[PDB]
Each structure stands twice: as C-alpha cells, then as structure tokens.
Design a protein around this ligand. Structure first.
Ligand SMILES: [Mg+2]
Ligand SMILES: [Mg+2]
Ligand SMILES: [Mg+2]
Ligand SMILES: [Mg+2]
Ligand SMILES: [Mg+2]
Ligand SMILES: [Mg+2]
Ligand SMILES: [Mg+2]
Ligand SMILES: [Mg+2]
Ligand SMILES: [Mg+2]
Lengths: 236, 125, 225, 63
RNA sequence: CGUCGGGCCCGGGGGAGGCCACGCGCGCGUCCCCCGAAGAGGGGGACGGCGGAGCGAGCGCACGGGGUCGGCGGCGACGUC
RNA sequence: GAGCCCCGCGGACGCUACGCCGCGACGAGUAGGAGGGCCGCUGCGGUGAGCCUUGAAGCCUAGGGCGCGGGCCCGGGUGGA
C-alpha cells in the first residue's frame, strides 16, 4: 500500500512519463500472466407441517405504479456536497478580524478560528465584549480585514464540528391538524455546553487581545458607511 | 388476419375515441386502452385482459383461447381471482411468463391489476 | 458451450482493445515526429537567413503555399461574379473562414473578390487554435463536430489521414491530400472580431481591412478566436 | 445571413403510395422493412416502385 | 571555411547527467565485437515488422460520450402566501 | 476433458409503423402556387348502452385554463327544450 510514487505538479499531469513510471514501480519484473443470500431457510414450525420454509427476502412489490420515469444517464461528475473540496480565500488566515454582513450581527467585528469541514467559517468574538457567541458564518458574506492577531498555541476543542452547530428542530411530532399551536420551544435555549465551551475558548484569547492597545474598543465598534468614504477606495 | 383488422379499424371503429390531442379505444380487452396494434384487444389471435370482478371484490382475467377464433361465445375464458395483491400479481405474471401468451403485455396487465385492486380498496378520508 | 462463447467474446474484446492502444501509440509517435519536423523548417527559416546575412547577401523566403480567408462583407447587393467566386470558396456566410492552397489561379481568384474578404498567411499556432476550437467536418454532407480521431479516420483514413495532427500536417505543410482534407472541413463559422476592425470598406493597405495582410492575419485570428 | 437558393431544398418524390389500398400499405411496410434491413438495392428499387401512380407503373404485356 | 544543419542527431570507441509510449522465453534471421587454428568454426552483444499452436484481476482517482448535492436557512390563516 | 443458467423463477418504458427515435442544415416576403388544419358553420349516412327538465340551444361574465393561431374546454349567472 505505497503512495502514488508520482508527484502531481499540475492537476492531470504526472511528473514522470510512462517509461519513467514503469522504471520506478518496476513492472519489468512483476509481470503476471493468468490466474447473497436471496433466500433464508427458516425452520419448520410444525408439527405435521413438515418441510422447512425457505423464506425469501427482498419480496416482490405488491403494487406497481401505473407509470414510471426512465433512469437518468450517468454523469461522471457532480459529487455530493459532502465531499466537495473546500476552497479558502487567500486573504483569510486564522486570527484575522472579520466583519459580519448579513446575520443579525451586521457590521460586528469578530475573530476567526479554524475553518469548519463543511466550508463554513467557525468564528467567535469576546461574547463579553461584543455579544457574538461561537457561531458559523460564510466566507462569502464577510469582508476580510488586514488586521491579524496571532492565535497560535490555543486549543479548539474537538467537539466543534458543524454537527454541533446544526440547528435543532422540534415540530411537529404526532400533530397533524394545527389547531393547538405549539407555544413552546420558540425561545432557543442556550444549553450549558455552549456556555462552557465559549468560556473555555475565550479565556485563552481575552488576555492575548488585551496586549495590543484599543482592540477592545476596536471590536466593540460596528462597521458602517458615512457620506464620505467609499468601499472600493478603502483598503481593508 | 390480424394486421388487416388493425389497419381497417385503426382510424374508424366504435371503440376508438379521438379527443383533444389524444387517442384512446374502449375495447373490452384493451390493455392501456390505447389505439395500438400491439395493445388492441380484438384483432389478436391470442389476447389478454384484466377487469374488476363482478362484485366489489377481486380481479378477473380473460384469456382468448386458440381454437374458437370464429366463435366469440366460447372464444374467451374468464376467471376471477379474489386473493391478496401479492399472490394475485404473482399468479397473473405466471400466466403470461410461463404460458408465453403474448409475453409483451405482461407488466401492462400487472399494472392494470394493481391499479384495479388499489381502486378496489376503500379510500381513507 | 457457454464458456466457449464467453472465451470467444473475450478474445474479440481483447483484440479490439489491443488494436486500439496500438493505434493510440501510432498517433502519439506520429505527432512526436510532426513536432520534430515543425521545429525544423522554423529553425531553418531562421538559419539560412542568418547565414546569408553573415555573407552579406539576401535570403528571400518562398511565398507561403497556404492562406486563410475570411469574409468581411454581408450578402446584400453582391455582383454575380463576386457572389459566384465566393460560393466557390465556401464563404457563403459573413465571417465564414476557410483555408486555400495558393497558386496563380487562386491568387487571381482572390484578386477578383478583394473587397469582400480579408486574408493572409496564418502560422502554426493560429491553425491549431482554429482547427481545435471550431473544427467541423462534412460527413454525409452533415456538419459534425471534430471530437474524436476515429471520426476523422472514418473518411480521411483512405488517404492515410487518421489523427488530428495528420490534418494539421496536411494543412500547414500543404501535401498531396490537401484538397480532400480542405473540402472535408466545414467552413469555419466565427464570431465577430472583438475590438472592431477600424474600417470595413477600404483595402487593408489604405488603413482598412479588405484584402491581404501577410502576418496580421494572426492578430486578427487571436481577436477572432 | 446565408445565400442559399432555397427553392430546390425540398426534393419532390413519393414517400409512400398516395392510395389507401390496404394490402398495398401492408406490403409497403413489408418491403420498407426489407430494404431497410438488407443490403440489396433490388429491394430498394421494388420499394420505390410500389409508390408511383398507375401511369408510372404501366402494365406489362405477356409477349 | 561556416551551419545551437540533416542523415529514427551515419557511426563507432572511452570515462568516478538528462530523455525514452524502451524492457518474457526459445529459436530464426539483420548488424556488430572476440578469438579467427583459410580473416574457417565456435564465443558473445544490439535490432527485428520473423517463427504450428488460448486468459490477468482487484481495487481506486478523475479538466473523461450535456448537473448535481449523500447542502442549508426563514415564513405561515381571519392576515398574509 | 462437458459445466445443457439458476438459493431463487426473476427483470423499466416502448412499436396509434399514417408510430416513435437520432443527427445536420435552414427559417423574409406582395402578386401567385402548394400542404396541413384534433380551426370553424349547416345538413346526411354510421358510430358514442353519447349528453339532456337534478336544465339542451342561445346569451352574459373583473372566473379558471389550453392552443403560435384558426379557435376550444371548463366555473358562475340567465334561459327553459
Ligand atoms: Mg450596401
Ligand atoms: Mg469590449
Ligand atoms: Mg459601397
Ligand atoms: Mg438566419
Ligand atoms: Mg424564400
Ligand atoms: Mg542542427
Ligand atoms: Mg546515431
Ligand atoms: Mg417564409
Ligand atoms: Mg346554460
């Protein structure tokens, strides 16, 4: 089970040609010439019912729809979103200051921790400072600033997958006719797990940010536009 | 012969129905009820058909026998099946698969029996 | 006898697979040889001029045997003679380019329809880009996109033209089978030239674009495709 | 635009018998399929010979 | 005399890097080398498109014969869709 | 030196051939010519175990739709053979 023995220098092209590959993997010497279950048999269950019942699985359907759709052609591409490769904008590096643009925190400045496996951005702020908790955000809906703080030698707990942030739903279990409205669960409770994780992750970044001056005041502010400056002329 | 009957009746018939951009036909043994040489229920020397049972329960299947081509009285044999969906479906597939009785209308008949039995089953409000 | 039929079928499949990769290797090595050639006349057309200069004398190069023609005028109000010669050249549309072998007869043809066309002598890279990007062939008088070499050898094979580089070699180096391959290619339907052309009526020499340009045909092609 | 004289694009030839003769239609199907699935131009010539009018199918004398 | 010339870069010989879509036998040829005791006969190398006689499979990745997700968010009856 | 499928009994649609499917090119138009019209009106021979006083024709309609179009279908009302 060796590695590919062929470094990709540009995608689709191998660093060596077929003869070099032959030489390197040595097919000059290893040249080789030549060389369930559908039915389970259940016991009898008699008596005088002799003959074990061969019970077949994958039973034939008892109903067939009147028409159908022919199967699609084969696509050879377009893998599901689960294994899409994740691209990161070059301007984004662990520990920069970002600015929120769509969510209910429009204009806030947050700090940027590791990027989630799904491609979403796992960011947070000093909740104590800007009331921004551990929250996912999209790399496309934020503007990257040049202001970078070093966040090396900090620990991001393993239980911070996208599944951890996945929105939870309650409705609607065993309620078909909506006449008694479910007047509970509307207040999304903040479970203690989020609290403890937030506290632990911020405790190690609060002093680090407290070193460089007026970053507290920096992050407390909310970005905005005035009758002067224009975004393209600005340098972020 | 068969192909004659097909072309003489293909566009004029008591059962043919031409309507707003479709065509159908209402022969007693017309699978798919569509005006086709293959699915026509009258011209073929060997023909099938499935219809609901006389009462409100079951499926009847009609087979055109071989010998009585010129005698419509005994040209068909009808048998009603009043078993569950799966066994009846298996039986009717057995008719045409094991008998080679025009093994082209097979799952056409399968679908017609399935839909007939479904419609037969009562509707939940 | 079922296993007998299966081994026979595997025999046929292996034979065809083997023939296929033999053909692939053939066209690979043939393309390598074509590249070795293509370098050669370029290097020469450098070096004899170099050496005549070192001798203080002149080295004229031969007038190219191949030219590319593009039509630059519409179809409204066309004199019958110009219309007919254009129909001869398969330039039935505006921007409907096609290749042509050069001789006295063809040059006189071009002198007839000077204003309705723009032409010149394309180089290798222009030929490659054109034939790859917009290569369409006449098979049973049907314009089919050149997307497979076997599709070529279906009809061009009888003259030994199999792979696409065989067409390129036949075209750039105008060989024995130039006429057949040229007629085989559907005339190239092209876009409109990005950035304009600064005039359409007058001849290229007097600031326009009608007529002949020796090399700027390649700039026009890059802006063209 | 393209300068094609479109008056001659549609070649006029019989695609099928102009009649409604039922047996004729049947053997037209038969020989249509035959000439499609066989490499004998004889079949093609007979096929196209089933189409034209009676004036183009003159009766052959015994002699 | 000159050619970052050609001759599958004709060729050969030698020494403390790169390129090859070059790499089963056995035999038959073609060429080359050794002894050559006829410069005979054997010993070896290189090439072959030459010679009665069956077959790899087993997984993956994809700039590969026309888009999918095995991604997600919000809102809902007397006011809205 | 015979393995004649099968633990199975199994296996999408299709082909009104005057139908369906594939590919390419093309599409202006008076006078004029041709083809199709499941466009339309009236009456006749057949056919729909057609519709109809539990409401036909006809007319009206800010109602719903189809057809590229000729036009058509349905909802609501009036009307009464
Ligand atoms: Mg003009
Ligand atoms: Mg521009
Ligand atoms: Mg003018
Ligand atoms: Mg046009
Ligand atoms: Mg016209
Ligand atoms: Mg050289
Ligand atoms: Mg050499
Ligand atoms: Mg027209
Ligand atoms: Mg009314």
């Amino acid at each position: 089970p060796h590695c590919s023995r062929n470094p990709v220098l540009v995608r689709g092209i191998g660093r060596y040609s077929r003869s070099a590959m032959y030489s390197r993997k040595a097919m000059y010497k290893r040249k080789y010439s030549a060389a369930v279950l559908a039915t389970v048999t259940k016991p009898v269950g008699g008596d005088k019912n002799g003959g074990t019942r061969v019970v077949k699985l994958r039973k034939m359907p008892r109903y067939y729809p009147t028409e159908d759709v022919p199967r699609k052609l084969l696509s050879h591409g377009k893998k599901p979103f689960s294994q899409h490769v994740r691209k990161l904008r070059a301007s984004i590096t662990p520990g920069t200051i970002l600015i929120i643009l769509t969510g209910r925190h429009r204009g806030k400045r947050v700090v940027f921790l590791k990027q989630l496996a799904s491609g979403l951005l796992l960011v947070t702020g000093p909740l104590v400072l800007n009331r921004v908790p551990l929250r996912r955000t999209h790399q496309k809906f934020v503007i990257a600033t040049s202001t970078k703080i070093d966040i090396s030698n900090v620990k991001i707990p393993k239980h911070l997958t996208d599944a951890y942030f996945k929105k939870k739903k309650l409705r609607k279990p065993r309620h078909q006719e909506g006449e008694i409205f479910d007047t509970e669960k509307e207040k999304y409770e903040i479970t203690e797990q989020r609290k403890i994780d937030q506290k632990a992750v911020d405790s190690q970044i609060l002093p680090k940010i407290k070193a460089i001056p007026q970053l507290q005041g920096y992050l407390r502010s909310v970005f905005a536009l005035t009758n002067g400056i224009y975004p393209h002329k600005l340098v972020f | 012969s068969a192909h004659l009957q097909w072309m003489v009746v293909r566009n004029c018939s008591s059962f043919l129905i031409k309507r707003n951009k479709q065509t159908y036909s209402t022969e007693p043994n017309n699978l798919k009820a569509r005006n086709s040489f293959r699915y026509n229920g009258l011209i073929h020397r060997k023909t099938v058909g499935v219809e609901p049972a006389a009462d409100g329960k079951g499926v009847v299947v009609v087979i055109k026998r071989r010998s009585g081509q010129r005698k419509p009285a005994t040209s068909y044999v009808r048998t009603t099946i009043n078993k569950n969906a799966r066994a009846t479906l298996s039986s009717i597939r057995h008719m045409i698969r094991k008998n080679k009785y025009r093994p082209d209308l097979r799952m056409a008949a399968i679908r017609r029996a399935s839909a007939i039995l479904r419609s037969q089953k009562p509707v939940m409000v | 006898n079922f296993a007998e039929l299966k081994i026979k079928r595997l025999r046929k499949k292996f034979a065809q697979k083997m023939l296929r990769k033999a053909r692939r290797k053939l066209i690979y090595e043939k393309a390598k040889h074509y590249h070795k050639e293509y370098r050669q006349m370029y290097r020469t057309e450098i070096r004899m001029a170099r050496m005549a200069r070192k001798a203080g004398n002149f080295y004229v190069p031969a007038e190219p045997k191949l030219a590319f023609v593009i039509r630059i005028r519409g179809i409204n109000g066309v004199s019958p003679k110009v219309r007919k010669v254009l129909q001869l050249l398969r330039l039935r549309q505006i921007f409907n380019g096609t290749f042509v072998k050069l001789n006295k007869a063809s040059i006189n043809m071009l002198r007839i329809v000077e204003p309705y066309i723009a032409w010149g002598y394309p180089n290798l890279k222009s030929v490659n880009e054109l034939i790859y990007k917009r290569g369409y062939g006449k098979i049973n008088k049907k314009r089919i996109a050149l997307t497979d070499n076997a599709l070529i050898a279906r009809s061009l094979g009888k003259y030994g033209i199999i792979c696409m580089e065989d067409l390129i070699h036949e075209i750039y180096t105008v060989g024995k089978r130039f006429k057949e391959a040229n007629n085989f290619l559907w005339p190239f339907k092209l876009s409109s030239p990005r950035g304009g052309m600064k005039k359409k009526t007058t001849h290229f020499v007097e600031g326009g674009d009608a007529g002949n340009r020796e090399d700027q045909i390649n700039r026009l092609i890059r802006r063209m495709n | 635009g393209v300068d094609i004289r479109h008056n001659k694009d549609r070649k006029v030839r019989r695609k099928e018998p102009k009649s409604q003769d039922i047996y004729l239609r049947l053997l037209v199907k038969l020989y249509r399929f035959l000439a499609r699935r066989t490499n004998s131009t004889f079949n093609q010539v007979v096929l196209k010979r089933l189409f034209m009018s009676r004036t183009n199918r003159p009766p052959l004398s015994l002699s």
